[PDB]
Design a protein around this ligand. Structure first.
Ligand code: Y01
Ligand code: Y01
Ligand code: Y01
Ligand code: Y01
Ligand code: Y01
Ligand code: Y01
Ligand code: Y01
Ligand code: Y01
Ligand code: Y01
Lengths: 179, 179, 179, 179, 179, 179, 179, 179, 179
């Protein structure tokens, strides 16, 4: 992934006036989200489908049950969330050199943070179990499948949920501050 | 992929005078297309032929049915589209330092955007199913094949179609603005 | 891993006034931790699950016993520790350009160093043996499993424990210096 | 490996006053060690365990005999040696901007060079044979194993020993020069 | 099978006085039962467990589901029935050379014929299907298994049931004849 | 197969008065049917299911398509026909020692010969092809299967049909002779 | 097995004077033991070691656990018992043509019948389970193994125990008769 | 094969008056044909299709090329020839107990011997080579196949041709003797 | 094995005058040797080389170590011994119909019995262990191999040694009787 283009864009997008809460929120976003996703998370989800196995002899059942158990990977959801959260801060380049803008940005950023947090709760939950039960064609009746590295993905889920809750609390604090 | 050469060329190609609609179009192109293709999309289509399987014993039938089901990969079509869309904006370097030019650029950019959107509709459609039916030599009669990660590629297709429709609407808005 | 973003952040975060002990601690952190993790350690833990084998015919027992023997990889724990240790020094950017701060930073850095050292002692220990005994479902009764590169991971464990003990001694020396 | 961080640190660490012998030693270190390890040596030791085979049917005997024959890889020992040798020259950044220092640096650098040369002689020797005899559990009695690319690793061993002997001779020449 | 010992015993056991119905019953028994079992039936049930397959990867599930689907083979039940039916006629050798005996023999032969016919109805039924559903340990949940030569074993079942019904009708005819 | 019991029964069953046509029919039956089935035919149909293959990866499709292509083996049909044809001649033992009988025997033997000849025509035909097309569950759509020793089974079919036609012509000749 | 030599020897050994109980015992021995072992039992124990499987990857563990679970096959024990029981009746040929002898024969036959019945109880028991637990070298710790055709061997065990108990009761009846 | 039925039939068929040449012909037939086919030849052609291999990956090509190279096995042709040659001598049982007959028998026996000798020359030839070239569907273009035990089948072919030529010479000698 | 030819020869060879000890010896030979070898022993040694395995990857090492561990099978040694022991009793047919002969026969029979008993002690011993150690070419150094059915072959060895010792004691008793 070409993270240096996003780095240079975020360097040119952090020149806008911000409050204390906004700078604490940017510090949490830079440290607890970007460096961890861009350094640690890529290799964890590397052998997700290679080391996914099911107890059957039916061709094509592994693909069906893997696609049914993990519709979207965690890492790609987090990368999309990171890109979308910083979008309101990237519209400053277009709107500047070319206080209502600040309020609109804050409102949109709060709505995005809450939407992504709720979507993360509904998509995944709080844990990744080590077994899965599958009843999708072409598999015959119900079969059982086994997952790769479930403990380290439960740890990743819990850590990301905690960081997103912190950023949501700071967003609501600043929203109350504006009034 | 060497995306930093395109970055430096687009940095030297965005010095041309543009309208408000043109800057909104460039912002949508930079955010919703380049960062997602250059960060997220490369790894999704990595095991497309390795995890493609068919129910047969005939040598060479997997290659024939994979080539018949996916004549061109989605990711390479999107990269070519990204390069071609920014071509009219890259001819400014040749035509400058060396308002009719602006109008010609707008006309060509609208024609390219509509051509690629229609070609994307005719090549792929709106969904990627999880099964395929193949009747190509050397396969005997019709055989059935199974696809890798179909839900996340339906999600990618829908997202790209929405972004291309937004950029087409802005292109027609600016075309009407010029008159 | 994108270590150059952390490099540029640590270049912009080392402009704070520091004592002699703090500069010796930063030199030990830069040399004995970052260059070794960022150059040497990545390739050692590359085939940890591919070259992990157990003596059984049960599908899914390799995944269960590998997840039970190594809940979190050493390399990811060390990367997270490196990021967290430098966090108090990365809050200077937010708190500066925007002596109590120095004392609070020292207290938090000492607490983090001791917490990570104790957690490393409780998670892993001092050696990595070459055999493992597993009694987790779906494995039948107890089975025996064999580990990849155990001597070079015992060497890595001992080296990291020695460096962390040195940095803890310097942190307590500076804490006594402040009084 | 992130060799550009070490490059930038060595660029900022070569601003210290040095003698003629010290500059010849730095030239030999830069050319005959860093460029060869950082360009040529990484790919040679890539399939060391994949292309290591033994004549047996016992599960887990390949891991035991590979770990017994190569406790530490040559390439990682050389990288650690390169980092440690340049450490005395990297303490100048801390000790400068913040002739006894020069003498202490020379003494420590000579001790490190001799220690690593003797350790390299005792760990490996002068050649890498193409056969190995193993009598480690779980292997039954003694078994025979075959090695990958032994001639090119004997060539690498001899070349590195010659370069280290040259740098040791220059270190003792400068030590005599100081008196 | 040593059928010639039974042949010589039945040659020495058919010297007893019998009625017309008893000789018709012996003719049906000799032709429609002994020659067909002793010539045709042995090879049909030769690959019953070798060509029995189930859709699973679990060791030991084939043995469990084959033992659950066919507790006793058809051919061995028929051989035991043939031996037991001729037992009352083989007690004449002991009771002769050494009309109440004739009546007791007829009563016992009728009871045996009806018992075996009812047991054959309850054990097997009228058809052998080509699929089986198994939920026995160590198989996980329910699995599906496929049978070898089901049409020719349905034909064998129907033929044997018809012959046994004919012999039962003749036994009841003679029982009524005695009064 | 225990053919010597049938031999001894046919030796004790050929003591009945017969015409010239009946003795020619018995000679054709003894030579062209019993010796060939009892010597030559057993080994030809030994590997019928072992050397039967289909082009698929579906478990259980070989059993389904083999059972659909050969509901009853040729050799077992011929053995049953041989036993049934000689049945009217085996009722002489019961009816003798214990000319209307001769006429009834001739009528029943002609009816059996014609019934078996017509059934052989409808079951099999005149040739055994080397390919088969199968569309039975669990096979997906239509698959193609290959047969073992088809030329030698076409030769066997033609030879048996010719011999049965000769015996039918002699049976009708004797039936006309009686009037 | 050459059962016709034993047949001819038992034909020449049954010319001795015997009582009513002795003839009933010989009838039970001839029918319920010899014909069933010589016709039915040989094929049941044909694939005992081929269809015996264990859940392991260790070479040589199948042989060790099969030899530990079935030290002597049931069928060979029954054949030896049949030969030994008829031995006292086969010494009449030597002692005749060449009432104390009759009494000695009865005493020895009763002792043999009781010894074999008790040995059968202690060797096997009353049932054959479908699972076995093995802890014999070279198997690692305890492993689990699966048995072939356990229900039909429990049926065989029960039938043989019932017949042996009947023959023991008749032997003790005749022993009391002699006084 | 049940050769004892043919033995007993040939014992009852050699009671006809014969000349010296006819008895020499019967001696050659009994010794050089029946004992060798009935003792030696059965096991040679046992693994003809199991040990027949071709250099391809196409399913079903082995069956096609084996059926094309050996339309009828040598051993079955020889058994049929043996049965047919003795047929004229087996019609004596029907024609006797029930010199023109002798002449008709001699004429038919000579015609059969010459027909079978010429058919053996045209079907097979004089040698069995060790390679075969096959261009039959489903094989792609021409493929090469390898034969099992070719030298011992060339020896068998030559021996049988010599014996058949001797019997043909004796048949023509006796035909000339009759005139 | 054609044991009925030996049966008929031993029936025609037991017409010679013999003493009481000679008839007891013939009874022990007929019962405890011929019926057990001809009924029980053939199937025990059926899978001796198929179920013999060694822990290696070297082609041809199984054949070498099996031939080194079992130079001659037990069953073939016992069959040869049975044939040779009865040879002196088979020379009576030649020497009769065509008391010094009796003495010479007794002397030769005693010498043969003692020679075979001593040879059996030196060839095999008293037990068959379950492991074997092999150091024969092409095996590399020493390897370990595992044996099939060792307990039932130790039982067979002990039983045969006991019977041979009984027959040797009776032979020496009769030798002393002659004087
Ligand atoms: C996360 C995905 C699924 C939807 C992403 C939608 C974005 C494309 C949204 C989120 C932030 C939104 C922007 C937030 C702020 C505004 C400012 C608004 O203009 C101003 O505040 C300045 C001019 C004025 O004062 O009216 C125009 C719309 C815009 C750009 C919004 C348009 C819709 C945006 C770009
Ligand atoms: C997407 C693929 C399949 C075709 C790509 C074709 C391009 C090579 C096209 C699209 C944009 C086009 C250019 C758009 C604008 C013009 C300007 C035109 O010149 C001017 O407007 C300036 C001089 C003048 O005023 O006449 C000369 C042709 C050119 C470069 C066009 C030539 C053909 C181009 C390069
Ligand atoms: C390692 C993981 C599991 C927890 C990481 C928690 C961090 C997010 C902690 C460790 C360092 C802490 C900071 C260390 C120093 C302080 C300074 C404190 O403010 C000051 O010293 C300046 C203003 C003043 O003088 O009060 C406010 C809290 C803060 C940022 C702390 C908040 C909590 C932080 C960021
Ligand atoms: C290779 C591994 C196994 C051990 C690496 C140990 C290093 C951490 C050693 C080697 C070089 C040593 C340094 C070489 C020079 C000196 C200078 C000495 O101070 C001075 O010369 C300046 C002040 C003065 O003049 O006293 C303080 C110790 C120090 C940093 C040494 C401390 C121990 C160091 C850092
Ligand atoms: C099929 C299996 C499960 C049970 C087999 C039981 C047999 C052992 C049965 C069936 C036939 C029975 C026999 C049928 C006839 C009689 C005759 C009866 O004696 C007489 O009729 C003659 C003396 C008299 O007139 O009393 C003594 C019992 C006996 C042998 C019966 C005893 C029990 C037998 C042998
Ligand atoms: C081939 C299969 C499917 C059916 C086999 C049916 C047989 C059991 C048939 C064919 C020959 C038939 C027999 C042919 C001749 C007669 C003679 C008939 O009696 C007599 O001719 C003698 C007494 C008299 O003169 O009436 C009684 C029926 C019976 C035995 C027939 C009964 C039915 C039989 C046995
Ligand atoms: C089942 C296995 C383990 C041991 C088999 C031992 C046999 C060899 C036993 C069982 C029956 C026994 C025989 C039973 C009867 C007698 C009769 C006895 O002589 C007589 O009764 C007749 C002369 C006399 O009246 O003394 C001599 C011993 C002998 C043959 C016994 C010797 C030992 C025998 C042969
Ligand atoms: C080898 C296969 C392909 C054909 C086998 C045909 C047989 C069935 C042939 C060969 C010998 C032939 C027989 C040879 C001798 C004669 C004698 C002939 O009658 C006599 O010689 C006696 C009465 C008389 O003198 O006319 C009637 C035909 C018959 C049986 C022939 C009929 C046709 C037979 C049986
Ligand atoms: C077991 C194998 C390895 C050697 C087998 C050798 C046999 C072929 C031996 C054992 C018994 C021997 C026979 C035992 C008895 C004698 C009798 C002897 O003649 C007589 O006693 C009758 C005439 C006379 O009184 O001299 C001639 C040799 C011969 C047949 C012996 C010749 C050698 C024989 C056949």
């Amino acid at each position: 992934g070409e993270w240096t283009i996003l780095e240079r864009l975020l360097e040119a997008a952090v020149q806008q006036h911000s409050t204390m809460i906004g700078r604490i929120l940017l510090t949490v976003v830079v440290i607890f989200r970007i460096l961890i996703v861009a350094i640690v998370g890529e290799t964890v989800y590397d052998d997700e489908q290679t080391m996914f196995v099911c107890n059957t002899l039916q061709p094509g059942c592994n693909q069906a049950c893997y696609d049914r158990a993990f519709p979207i990977s965690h890492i790609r959801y987090w990368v999309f969330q990171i890109i979308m959260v910083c979008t309101p801060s990237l519209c400053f380049i277009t709107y500047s050199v070319h206080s209502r803008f600040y309020i609109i940005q804050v409102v949109f950023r709060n709505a995005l943070e809450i939407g992504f947090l709720v979507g993360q709760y509904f998509l995944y939950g709080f844990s990744v179990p080590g077994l899965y039960e599958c009843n999708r064609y072409p598999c015959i009746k119900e079969v059982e499948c086994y997952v790769s590295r479930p403990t380290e993905k439960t740890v990743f889920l819990v850590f990301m949920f905690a960081v997103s809750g912190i950023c949501v609390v700071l967003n609501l604090a600043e929203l109350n501050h504006l009034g």
